[PDB]
């Protein structure tokens, strides 16, 4: 922001804003998927006990 | 004076104020043009060479 004019320099800030979103979202879904398996776990967990 | 194509002449300037005000507002300049940086802001980033 402090180099470039700012009405081109939206183009790379969305597309540095996008990435990060990407990875954001990815480590969601991740933790989505391993979430569950540990609630499958806690389940089986729960009927052994 | 100004030197040949092959001959281009090359100085390194240091230690100084680096105030583009008078020169880019001077002249009429009929080609000017920067690459990595806005040519409205050079006068907030400092330089090493």
């Known amino acids: 922001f402090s180099r470039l004019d700012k009405v081109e320099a939206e183009v790379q800030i969305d597309r540095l804003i996008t990435g990060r979103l990407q990875s954001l979202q990815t480590y969601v879904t991740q933790q989505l998927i391993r979430a569950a398996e540990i609630r499958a776990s806690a389940n089986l967990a729960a009927t052994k006990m | 004076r100004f030197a ?9 300037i240091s230690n100084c104020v680096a105030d ?25 980033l400092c330089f090493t060479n």
């Open chain 2, 20 to 44: 583009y005000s008078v020169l880019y507002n001077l002249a009429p300049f009929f080609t000017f043009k920067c690459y990595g940086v806005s040519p409205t802001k050079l006068n907030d």
């Open chain 2, 4 to 12: 040949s194509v092959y001959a281009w002449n090359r100085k390194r």
